[PDB]
Amino acid sequence: EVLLQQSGPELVKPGASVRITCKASGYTFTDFNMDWVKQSPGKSLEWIGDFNPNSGGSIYNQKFKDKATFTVDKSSSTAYMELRSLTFEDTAVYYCARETGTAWFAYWGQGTLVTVSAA
Amino acid sequence: EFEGRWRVIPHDVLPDWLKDNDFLLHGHRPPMPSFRACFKSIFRIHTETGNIWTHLLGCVFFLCLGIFYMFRPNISFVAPLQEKVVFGLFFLGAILCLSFSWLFHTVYCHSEGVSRLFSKLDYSGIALLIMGSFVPWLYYSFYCNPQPCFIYLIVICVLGIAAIIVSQWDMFATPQYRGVRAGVFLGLGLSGIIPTLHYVISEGFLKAATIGQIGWLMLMASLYITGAALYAARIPERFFPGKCDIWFHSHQLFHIFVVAGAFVHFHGVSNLQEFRFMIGGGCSEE
Amino acid sequence: DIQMTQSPASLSASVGETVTITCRASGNIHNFLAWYQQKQGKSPQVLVYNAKTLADGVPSRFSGSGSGTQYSLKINSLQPEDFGSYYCQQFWSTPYTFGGGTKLEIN
Ligand SMILES: CCCCCCCCCCCCCCCC(=O)OC[C@H](O)COP(=O)(O)OCCN
Ligand SMILES: CCCCCCCC/C=C/CCCCCCCC(=O)OC[C@@H](O)CO
Ligand SMILES: CCCCCCCC/C=C\CCCCCCCC(=O)OC[C@@H](O)CO
Ligand SMILES: CCCCCCCC/C=C\CCCCCCCC(=O)OC[C@@H](O)CO
Ligand SMILES: CCCCCCCC/C=C\CCCCCCCC(=O)OC[C@@H](O)CO
Ligand SMILES: CCCCCCCC/C=C\CCCCCCCC(=O)OC[C@H](O)CO
Ligand SMILES: CCCCCCCC/C=C\CCCCCCCC(=O)O
Ligand SMILES: [Zn+2]
């Protein structure tokens, strides 16, 4: 079975950075594209971007161009997403989601909750 | 362009209706229910690139060859109106089968409904090419024996129509019946052994060899047999699984054997009309 | 950018009844549509992709239809486990977009 496991919840302060890791297994990692999805509390889903592990290129939503950075480690079949200069607006559950030829998502990670708080 | 973006997928994640040969492992198109994305995939690298371009280049070749044939001067024909008709019926079957085929291979990955529809057009096309091939070839071999010529055109049409109706069957398109489809269409073409033996008996070995028939048809019989043998047993991808995904798999070479076999067929019956033009329509041979 | 308008935003129905979630795209998406169901706190799971293709393991009471810019998700004979949020998604044009979502409650 294909499984996407990502890191646990993050508690950070404003202006900090986070990197969410999505570790995939059960298939050849380079064969399919990896996408990232944001869901703010009580709101609907938003598309951050897509990353191709084979070529290494990525396509970012214009809204998250200066916010997200996609990296990869093909040896461990892990996808990463860096979030920079975090505000209270960036408090959300971030998902990884794998394509299958076209960008419909059959497999999803369990989600990583990012909570920004200066308390 | 950011519209209709897609990647090739391995064979194991394909839907059922798109698994026709498990020896091609990678490089398949995923199911995309947009004809716009399907027709632009013609300029993309995948498992069907060779299958479409072979029968799309071949479709315009016999289209232009078919129109040059209509504008050749009637100076050279014993009956120009009906001679251009029997040839046009061959060109009609040749163009339709090549057009049905490259269109099917283009929209193959659209949806299950579109796939089954264009597959039935793909199978019916090859029957039309086989019946169309028999018409100019018979009207010359039995030129002076009209009634054997007219029964043999009735039975190949009752066989080709039956072959078209059997292609409307759904389990016909399954990979378990790929040997059944091979023998059905091959038996359709090799049904011509009965008119050929009839011709040799009444005309003779020398006549059949002098006019050049027995040489051109065993070329036809070889291209018929070899093309069907590679298709039915999936050579060479059966020997090298995963290295013939894009170029030189069985379906690709079978497409090439059809274009070459139809051109070799045109070459033979075009010779039979130049031989008729020299001896004329008169008939006191006995 | 393609805008996806999902309707209704929320609804509540009884078990065994039929519900229909409509959705309209701001432009033609060429049947490159997917539907998802999301349970409380859990990850979304795909129900229908390519506008009509039912995903593996999804019961037959879910059915997607439509073409062009108007698509629909229908749930026949509602079951108690059908509560949650439902989202549409187009993957024809980037950036890909989701619908506003539809909250389904069962009584
Ligand atoms: C050159 C071949 C000569 C042989 C004779 C046969 C030629 C026939 C013509 C072949 C090419 C035709 C042009 C293809 C145009 C073409 O690809 O059109 C597809 C459309 O985009 C269909 O729209 P779709 O994406 O399915 O959805 C719209 C929203 N519902
Ligand atoms: C005297 C009868 C014999 C000579 C006349 C016929 C000459 C040859 C005809 C060629 C045209 C081919 C027609 C082929 C007709 C096929 C009909 C068919 O299979 O329909 C089923 C589908 O509609 C649904 O599955
Ligand atoms: C060029 C001269 C004529 C010879 C060429 C061949 C003539 C036409 C051949 C085959 C006809 C195929 C009919 C196929 C009928 C399928 C019905 C269909 O899909 O209708 C569309 C609707 O579902 C949606 O609007
Ligand atoms: C002057 C009268 C002479 C009569 C004796 C001649 C009899 C001819 C003998 C047999 C006719 C053919 C019988 C049937 C064999 C041909 C059909 C077949 O199975 O073809 C498969 C391959 O062979 C295709 O290449
Ligand atoms: C499940 C049944 C089918 C299994 C697959 C068998 C595929 C064999 C087909 C073609 C490759 C060999 C063709 C050439 C060798 C057979 C001899 C021949 O000329 O046969 C022509 C006709 O008499 C046949 O009816
Ligand atoms: C010399 C000239 C040669 C000309 C050769 C022409 C070959 C193409 C003909 C017919 C294709 C089939 C047309 C009918 C099917 C199209 C509509 C369709 O696919 O509808 C599916 C469904 O309605 C929605 O998903
Ligand atoms: C002149 C027309 C024939 C020219 C020679 C063609 C070479 C191949 C001949 C016959 C192959 C018969 C078997 C076809 C296999 C099934 C095809 C299919 O289902 O797509
Ligand atoms: Zn083919």
Numbering used by the authors:
A (entry chain H): 1 to 119
B (entry chain A): -1 to 0, 100 to 383
C (entry chain L): 1 to 107
What does the paper say about this structure?
Human AdipoR1 and AdipoR2 belong to the progestin and adipoQ receptor family, and serve as the receptors for the antidiabetic adipokine, adiponectin. AdipoR1 activates the AMP-activated protein kinase (AMPK)2–4 pathways, while AdipoR2 activates the peroxisome proliferator-activated receptor-α (PPAR-α)5,6 pathways leading to the increased expression of uncoupling protein 2 (UCP2). Human AdipoR1 and AdipoR2 contain seven-transmembrane (7TM) domains, with an internal N terminus and an external C terminus, which is the opposite configuration to that of G protein-coupled receptors.
A conserved Asp residue exists near the zinc ion (Asp208 in AdipoR1 and Asp219 in AdipoR2). The D208A mutant of AdipoR1 [residues 89–375, designated hereafter as AdipoR1(A208)] retained the full ability to activate AMPK, whereas the corresponding D219A mutant of AdipoR2 [residues 100–386, designated as AdipoR2(A219)] lacked the ability to increase the expression of UCP212. These findings suggested that the putative enzymatic activity is important for the AdipoR2 activity. Accordingly, they suggested that the free fatty acid is the product of the putative ceramidase activity of AdipoR213. Furthermore, the ICL2 loop of AdipoR1 has three positively charged residues, Arg257, Lys262, and His263, whereas that of AdipoR2 has uncharged residues, Met, Gln, and Tyr, respectively, at the corresponding positions. AdipoR1, but not AdipoR2, reportedly interacts with the scaffolding proteins RACK1 and Cav-3 and the cyclin-dependent kinase CK2β20–22.
